Design a protein around this ligand. Structure first.
Ligand SMILES: CCCCCCCCCCCCCCCCCC(=O)OC[C@H](COP(=O)([O-])OCC(O)COP(=O)([O-])OC[C@@H](COC(=O)CCCCCCCCCCCCCCCCC)OC(=O)CCCCCCCCCCCCCCCCC)OC(=O)CCCCCCCCCCCCCCCCC
Ligand SMILES: CCCCC/C=C/C/C=C/C/C=C\C/C=C\CCCC(=O)O[C@H](COC(=O)CCCCCCCCCCCCCCCCC)COP(=O)(O)O[C@@H]1[C@H](O)[C@H](O)[C@@H](O)[C@H](O)[C@H]1O
Ligand SMILES: CCCCC/C=C/C/C=C/C/C=C\C/C=C\CCCC(=O)O[C@H](COC(=O)CCCCCCCCCCCCCCCCC)COP(=O)(O)O[C@@H]1[C@H](O)[C@H](O)[C@@H](O)[C@H](O)[C@H]1O
Ligand SMILES: CCCCC/C=C/C/C=C/C/C=C\C/C=C\CCCC(=O)O[C@H](COC(=O)CCCCCCCCCCCCCCCCC)COP(=O)(O)O[C@@H]1[C@H](O)[C@H](O)[C@@H](O)[C@H](O)[C@H]1O
Ligand SMILES: CCCCC/C=C/C/C=C/CCCCCCCC(=O)O[C@H](COC(=O)CCCCCCCCCCCCCCC)COP(=O)(O)OCC[N+](C)(C)C
Lengths: 56, 86, 180, 47, 469, 116, 89, 86
């Protein structure tokens, strides 16, 4: 499916899927620059229908 | 007066249908072998066409006119055996 | 191109199962329109080319159009085919399927015997011999003879049928008018 | 005591049988009051 | 002459206003009377059981079927009198007993479809007439559409009539698949021996019979009879019963059938013990029809059953008609009118009826004792002539089940009496407005027939002897 | 094998080809802003399509007659005359009742100006 | 006879065990009538006569009229209750 | 009625057996019907071909077990393209 003009999936991308997020502890994260990131996460209408008009 | 440009696409519609009908008539006559089609065929004329295909020998509507029929004509007669109709 | 009738039989089975199990009420109705088309295929297949177009004209073009027209501007609740709802039905479905199927196959037979009545329904294998006789001189097709016998021998049936069509006019009007 | 052709207890049906606890009871279609067509149950039916 | 009335009538009714509907019905009432009076001399055609077939073996006209059409016209005259005449001139009975614009149209179309069943010889005449009368009962049920119960009843009756019409169509084409024929005149006494037409003809009779209300499939019809209004249900209870049973008695295709005997025993059982603990008067009144249709399923087993049938038909018709008209009359005296379409429901509402119009209770007692089969009255000779045909032909267990069923059914017939002859605290003394002269004369005629109709039994048997033999 | 059935199967090939060409060829790229109880209706709307069908069943009931018109000459003619007139009477019912109208609910309020 | 018998039987059982809506009941009724048509027209072809074709052309018209009648009956059912229940009428 | 009318308006396939059975039934009254049992049988197996299906199953049961098969003037099958070819 890559031999097309639409943006096909790269083969080194399943390769990146088995790899996971191991981050440097000797770095500076969000609380360096003063922000905290957003996190990723029937019975009564029948009888009221009984008073309306449906066929004029 | 008369716009020629307005009536030219009508001219091509007219020419396309005219050429289609003419080419189709010659294709029909080439299929029959030089004669016109039969445009409304009875059950009787259906049976008559299969009888003449039996009599002429192979050809569609060759239309033999012979005195008395050939030898294989008494033996090439067909019945039709139709399936169980389940 | 021998097994055509068998194919239409099988496809009709499958189409009815898609009729009775469908998400949306009008998905079910389009499967019914497909079943009408399978019917007209079988009717041309057996030799009745007139009737197939009568089915497409009357059943598809009027009854199915009326049916779809009803489903559009009216509100119809639908549960879908839960397995919790309908496998309480299945043992009697199976018993009634086998019994009603065999019993519908039963009455084409004349024996004292029960399963000689049944297996004469499957004694199908013999190929009918079609003979030509030259006794008919004109294009009386099937619609012509229906028009002769609706109009001479069963003219009274046609006029009582006119009363039935009259009733099909008067009744739906008489229900849905609310006179002043 | 109203009786019911076998000496049974049957309800005397007055106007006090169509409330909204008598609404959609569990019963046979016999021996059941709360008719759906009543001048106290429709009461602005198509308004 | 029904066709003339329909053709004239829908033309005339499209141009009338709704103020004129009742008077239109009065017109049709008198019209049907002069079809009885001025045109019944056609009985002279049917001497010595001379039978005609009309429209190319399509319809069959004998004297049996002539009597059935006379009966249907008489009942239609009564019913159309009930719609076309006011009970009282109150502002009450105008908002209760009110005809629609297209009611008499559907009445006459249903009488047409009911006549073309009894007069029928072939199977497609039978089919077309069955669907004519079935669509007419669908629309007569649905014509008082401002009612939840009548709408639900018309939907239920549509689906349960559709199934049992497709069963009749399946039986007809199944008969056609083994005999290239449509007549039961095809059968002629020898074919039945050498051909298994048992399953076909019994499935035909069953699909015809489940529309009457025979016993495994009776509850849907009892619900339709309780849900329809009180004027509609006196017509839709009677007419399919007498039309379909008059077809199946004239055509003797279930003689000595085991299935019809099973369902007749079951019908007599479930109708007698079914309506015992019931407190609604139309329910009570519909299980009576279930038992009295069982007594006809008995005569379906019979050969040569035309006396017992016709006698018990006009018996049941007069008694049925009168017992619905009496509870039309009792609405003036109840302390509680609910439910504009169906103003009296519970049978305890007629409780003090002997102290208000005691002669209405005399009326009621007469027709209830004729339902039981008490010998001075007309229902006794119906049950008697049914027994004389049951015992003549070897149905001995059926006889005892008939007797036990009549004894059990007497309980809920007498429950009407037990309620109406009772003490009531506030009784009438003086009422200003009167019941309809025209319409109480009809109830009195129907009573005098029931009580003093045993007089003419020997006259009727002699006229029977000449025109059917 | 006639030239009738290549048509029946070939018109879908035409369609399947063209909607392929677009689905294969054009941009999809959608989003929320690009994307995007029940009402009551008058009686004549449902009436036109319900009463449509009994007239349609009459028109295809004439279709056996007009093919048999020579064989039933002077006799089936009168039977068809009676059939047509029986249905013309139900039609004059329908147009005398003014059934298929949707009529406007507000008048000029004709009722006059009286005083005291 | 097989196709008409099985469409009638499967159509009948789909009608009987319908608990989901009301229009499945209508279309199962119409497919029952189709199966009756199939059986009859096959018998007419096998017996070489029009009389099964006569009953079939009459029952086409009667099926149409019953559909018109019954769908107006459903519309009047719907007039007073602006909802149609899933479990049934 | 349409008692014996065929698809072409002629007489149907079993008209003659039926008319023989009705010729039987016209000149007989009951108590004497047991003699027109054969005509009725001739009609019924005209309709359904029960005895011919039984007979052809009896002969096909025997031709299935022969190694020899057919020593006879045989029957030919043709394509529909070749009814009168040679
Ligand atoms: C149609 C005839 C109606 C035309 C009316 C008279 C012409 C005219 O001048 O009209 C304006 C006229 C005054 O015009 P003007 O601008 O003052 O003077 C214009 C010059 O004369 C210039 O006038 P002109 O040169 O346009 O017309 C001259 C006329 C006369 O010239 C001749 O003498 C030679 C005649 C040779 C035959 C011409 C055949 C024309 C075929 C036309 C096709 C049908 C249209 O014929 C032509 O030469 C017209 C040539 C058309 C070529 C069209 C190309 C289409 C080809 C498609 C191929 C299809 C295969 C074939 O006023 C009116 O006619 C008022 C009446 C209007 C309503 C009349 C409607 C009637 C026709 C309804 C037709 C329905 C379709
Ligand atoms: C709805 C919508 C439409 C649906 C269609 C789907 C279904 C189609 C099938 C159609 C059926 C429809 C249903 C019909 C209802 C049932 C009908 C039915 O039982 O009549 C039985 C069948 O008599 C068979 O010979 C007995 C028949 C035996 C049948 C065997 C069945 C085998 C199933 C195995 C599993 C009638 O005997 P019957 O009472 O006259 O009794 C006979 C008695 O047995 C004889 O001795 C006498 O000669 C005779 O005088 C009489 O007394
Ligand atoms: C032989 C087969 C057996 C047949 C048994 C026959 C049954 C029904 C036969 C009916 C034939 C009827 C004959 C009765 C004719 C005589 C008759 O009483 O007049 C009617 C009933 O008029 C029908 O109700 C007319 C009912 C017509 C029904 C015709 C059915 C046919 C009763 O008026 P009526 O005096 O109480 O009352 C009126 C009226 O109330 C006052 O406004 C007037 O001041 C004054 O006119 C006063 O007289
Ligand atoms: C029958 C034929 C007769 C028709 C004659 C009319 C001729 C018309 C002239 C046609 C010219 C072609 C111009 C068409 C054009 O916009 O494609 C550009 C590419 O960039 C080129 O340009 C790529 C151009 C592709 C040109 C064809 C390549 C050879 C054919 C491959 C199949 C579209 O990118 P795109 O990613 O949005 O396109 C894809 C694709 O169209 C969809 O299938 C996908 O579902 C969708 O997600 C989307 O990603
Ligand atoms: C100018 C007259 C106009 C015609 C009037 C006709 C009205 C039709 C009414 C039907 C329901 C009312 C019951 C009337 C029963 C009539 C008995 C009768 O006569 O029916 C006959 C025997 O019935 C049978 O087998 C069995 C019939 C059982 C009857 C059992 C009920 C007995 C008691 C009521 C009948 C006697 C009432 C007489 C009161 C003076 C059989 O048919 P027919 O060809 O001989 O009819 C001839 C009657 N004509 C001359 C008046 C036309």
């Amino acid at each position: 499916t890559q031999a097309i003009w639409w943006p096909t999936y790269s083969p080194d991308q399943v390769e990146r899927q088995f790899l996971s997020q191991k981050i440097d502890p000797s770095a500076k994260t969000f609380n360096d620059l003063d922000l905290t990131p957003m996190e990723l996460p029937v019975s009564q209408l029948e009888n009221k229908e009984k008073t309306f008009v449906h066929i004029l | 007066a008369i716009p020629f440009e307005a009536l030219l696409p009508y001219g091509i519609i007219f020419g396309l249908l005219t050429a289609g009908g003419g080419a189709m008539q010659v294709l029909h006559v080439y299929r029959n072998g030089g004669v016109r089609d039969r445009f409304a065929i009875d059950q009787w004329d259906s049976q008559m066409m299969e009888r003449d295909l039996r009599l002429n020998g192979g050809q569609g509507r060759k239309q033999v006119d012979q005195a008395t029929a050939p030898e294989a004509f008494k033996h090439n007669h067909v019945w039709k055996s139709e399936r169980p109709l389940i | 191109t021998y097994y055509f009738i068998e194919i239409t039989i099988f496809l009709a089975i499958l189409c009815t199962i898609f009729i009775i199990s469908a998400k949306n009420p009008m998905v079910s109705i389009l499967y019914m329109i497909a079943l009408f088309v399978i019917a007209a295929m079988y009717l041309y297949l057996i030799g009745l080319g007139i009737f197939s177009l009568l089915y497409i004209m009357i059943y598809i073009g009027a009854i199915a159009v009326l049916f779809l027209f009803i489903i559009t501007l009216l509100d119809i609740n639908s549960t879908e085919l839960s397995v919790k709802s309908n496998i309480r039905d299945l043992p009697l479905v199976l018993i009634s399927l086998i019994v009603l199927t065999i019993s519908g196959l039963m009455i084409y037979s004349n024996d004292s015997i029960l399963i000689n009545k049944l297996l004469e329904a499957f004694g199908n294998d013999y190929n009918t011999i079609i003979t030509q006789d030259w006794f008919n001189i004109e294009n009386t097709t099937l619609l012509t003879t229906i028009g002769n016998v609706l109009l001479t021998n069963n003219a009274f049936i046609l006029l009582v049928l006119a009363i039935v069509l009259l009733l099909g006019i008067i009744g739906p009007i008489s229900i849905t008018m609310k006179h002043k | 005591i109203p009786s019911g052709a076998l000496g049974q207890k049957v309800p005397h049906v007055d106007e006090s049988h169509q409330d909204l606890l008598f609404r959609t009871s569990h019963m046979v279609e016999d021996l059941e009051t709360y008719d759906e067509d009543s001048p106290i149950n429709t009461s602005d039916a198509n308004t | 002459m029904l066709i003339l009335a329909i053709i004239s009538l829908i033309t005339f009714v499209s141009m009338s206003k709704l103020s004129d509907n009742r008077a239109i019905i009065r017109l049709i009432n008198i019209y049907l009377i002069l079809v009885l009076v001025l045109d019944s001399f056609l009985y002279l055609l049917f001497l010595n059981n001379q039978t005609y077939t009309v429209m190319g073996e399509l319809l069959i006209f004998n004297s049996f079927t002539f009597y059935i059409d006379m009966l249907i016209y008489f009942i239609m005259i009564v019913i159309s009198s009930l719609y076309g005449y006011n009970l009282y001139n109150n502002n009450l009975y105008k908002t209760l007993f009110e005809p629609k614009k297209e009611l008499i149209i559907l009445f006459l179309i249903n009488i047409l479809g009911a006549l073309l069943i009894v007069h029928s010889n072939d199977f497609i005449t039978l089919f077309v007439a069955i669907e004519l009368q079935s669509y007419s009962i669908y629309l007569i049920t649905a014509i008082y559409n401002s009612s939840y119960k009548a709408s639900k009843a018309s939907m239920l009756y549509f689906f349960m009539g559709g199934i049992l019409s497709i069963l009749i169509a399946y039986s007809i084409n199944t008969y056609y698949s083994v005999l290239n024929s449509y007549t039961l005149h095809s059968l002629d006494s020898l074919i039945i021996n050498t051909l298994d037409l048992n399953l076909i003809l019994i499935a035909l009779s069953l699909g015809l019979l489940f529309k009457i209300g025979i016993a495994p499939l009776h509850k849907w019809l009892i619900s339709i009879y309780e849900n329809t209004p009180i004027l509609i249900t006196i017509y839709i209870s009677l007419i399919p019963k007498i039309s379909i049973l008059s077809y199946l008695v004239l055509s003797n295709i279930s003689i000595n059938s085991l299935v019809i005997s099973i369902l007749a025993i079951l019908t007599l059982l479930v109708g007698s013990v079914g309506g015992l603990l019931q407190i609604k008067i139309k329910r009570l009144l519909a299980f009576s029809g279930l038992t009295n249709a069982g007594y006809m399923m008995l005569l379906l087993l019979l050969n040569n059953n035309e006396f017992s049938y016709l006698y018990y038909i006009t018996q049941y018709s007069i008694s049925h008609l009168a017992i619905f008209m009496i509870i039309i009359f009792s609405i003036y005296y109840i302390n509680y009118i609910n439910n504009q379409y169906n103003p009296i429901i519970y049978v305890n509402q007629l409780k003090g009826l002997i102290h208000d119009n005691a002669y209405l209770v005399l009326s009621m007692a007469i027709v209830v004792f004729s339902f039981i089969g008490i010998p001075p009255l007309l229902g006794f000779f119906g049950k008697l002539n049914i027994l004389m045909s049951i015992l003549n032909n070897g149905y001995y267990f059926i006889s005892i089940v008939l007797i036990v069923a009549s004894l059990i059914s007497a309980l809920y017939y007498l429950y009407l009496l037990n309620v109406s002859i009772q003490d009531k605290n506030n009784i009438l003394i003086n009422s200003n407005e009167t019941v309809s002269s025209v319409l109480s004369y009809i109830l009195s005629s129907l009573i005098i027939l029931i009580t003093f109709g045993f007089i003419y039994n020997s006259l009727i048997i002699d006229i029977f002897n000449v025109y059917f033999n | 094998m006639n030239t009738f059935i290549i048509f029946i199967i070939l018109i879908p090939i035409v369609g399947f080809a063209l909607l392929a060409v677009n689905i294969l060829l054009a941009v999809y790229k959608p989003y929320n802003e690009k994307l995007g109880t029940r009402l009551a209706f008058n009686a004549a709307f449902i009436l036109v399509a319900i009463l449509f069908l009994p007239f349609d069943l009459e028109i295809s009931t004439l279709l056996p007659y007009v093919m048999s018109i020579y064989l039933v000459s002077n006799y089936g003619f009168t039977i068809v005359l009676l059939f047509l007139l029986i249905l013309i009477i139900g039609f004059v019912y329908e147009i005398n009742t003014n059934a298929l109208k949707i009529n406007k609910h507000n008048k000029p309020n004709t009722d006059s100006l009286i005083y005291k | 006879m097989f196709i008409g018998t099985i469409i009638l039987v499967l159509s009948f059982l789909g009608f009987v065990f319908n608990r989901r809506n009301i229009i499945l009941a209508f279309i199962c009724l119409e497919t029952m009538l189709l199966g009756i048509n199939l059986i009859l027209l096959r018998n007419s072809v096998l017996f070489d006569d029009i009389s099964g074709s006569l009953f079939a052309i009459v029952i086409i018209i009667l099926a149409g009229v019953e559909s018109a009648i019954g769908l107006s009956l459903l519309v009047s059912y719907y007039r007073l209750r602006g909802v149609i229940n899933s479990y049934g009428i | 009625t349409a008692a014996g009318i065929s698809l072409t308006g002629g007489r149907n396939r079993c008209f003659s057996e039926w008319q023989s059975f009705m010729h039987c039934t016209a000149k007989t009254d009951a108590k004497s019907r047991a003699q027109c049992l054969p005509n009725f049988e001739d009609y019924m197996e005209c309709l359904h071909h029960t005895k011919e299906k039984a007979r052809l199953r009896e002969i096909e049961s025997v031709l299935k077990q022969k190694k020899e098969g057919l020593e006879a003037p045989p029957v030919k099958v043709i394509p529909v393209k070749a009814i009168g070819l040679v």
